[PDB]
Design a protein around this ligand. Structure first.
Ligand SMILES: CC(C)(C)OC(=O)N[C@H]1CCCCC/C=C\[C@@H]2C[C@@]2(C(=O)NS(=O)(=O)C2CC2)NC(=O)[C@@H]2C[C@@H](OC(=O)n3cc4cccc(F)c4c3)CN2C1=O
Ligand SMILES: [Zn+2]
Length: 198
């Protein structure tokens, strides 16, 4: 009934994939109890850094990537949820279920990737465990893993980036193409779609 209807919580930044140095590693910035509280209030005063965030809802965890001043992720993780911020919940500025894409204004302190203009097909996928996986681009929205992996290895990495050799954003990881539980290829949202959305 009306008076007791609940609201979904906010997406919460719980960590980041550190790519700044010579070693890529995942960093946690908030534990599970703090995550749950922050999702409910939508108020997150933690400092944000970096290009790739680890994000969570009450039920899922995935990645989000800043490109051109927007923190982008997948709709199948975020839905229409707000993101927690120092001043309270922030509404999505982009939502496109057809592309599986959402975005919010990038948090203060984040750094953004630049869309790739290289026209090159040797790519790198960054996972939530900070693995950097070589991917050969095979079409507008597909690339093949040079070394196939069980889907377990990729689960929770949607929203993360595919990058070119120079570290530009080429796309956002969306789905794994798997046969018998092995991912031989990935599907991604090309950066040009994000640029058109903007
Ligand atoms: C499309 C094709 C070729 C048929 O393949 C697949 O449908 N395959 C599956 C294999 C699933 C097994 C796990 C694979 C491991 C990791 C996957 C990356 C990942 C993930 O980590 N999510 S998450 O755990 O972070 C999660 C917490 C956020 N995404 C998924 O599971 C997505 C979600 C879902 O797809 C979609 O809702 N759409 C909506 C779309 C709209 C437009 C175009 C698209 F393609 C769309 C795909 C099925 N998904 C796959 O990948
Ligand atoms: Zn490039």
């Amino acid at each position: 009934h009306m008076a007791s209807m609940k609201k979904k919580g906010s997406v919460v930044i719980v960590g980041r994939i550190n790519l700044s140095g010579d070693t890529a590693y995942a960093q946690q910035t908030r534990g599970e109890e703090g995550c749950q509280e922050t999702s409910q209030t939508g108020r997150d005063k933690n400092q944000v850094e970096g290009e790739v965030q680890i994000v969570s809802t009450a039920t899922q965890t995935f990645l989000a990537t800043s490109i051109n001043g927007v923190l982008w992720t997948v709709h199948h993780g975020a839905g229409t949820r707000t993101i927690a911020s120092p001043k309270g919940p922030v509404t999505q500025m982009y939502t496109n279920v057809d592309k599986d894409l959402v975005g919010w204004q990038a948090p203060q302190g984040s750094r953004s990737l630049t869309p790739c203009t290289c026209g090159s097909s040797d790519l790198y996928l960054v996972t939530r465990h900070a693995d950097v996986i070589p991917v050969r681009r095979r079409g507008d929205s597909r690339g093949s893993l040079l070394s196939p992996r069980p889907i377990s290895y990729l689960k929770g990495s949607s929203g993360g980036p595919l990058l070119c050799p120079a570290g530009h954003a080429v796309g956002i990881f969306r789905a794994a193409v798997s046969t018998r539980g092995v991912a031989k290829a990935v599907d991604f949202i090309p950066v040009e779609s994000l640029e058109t959305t903007m």
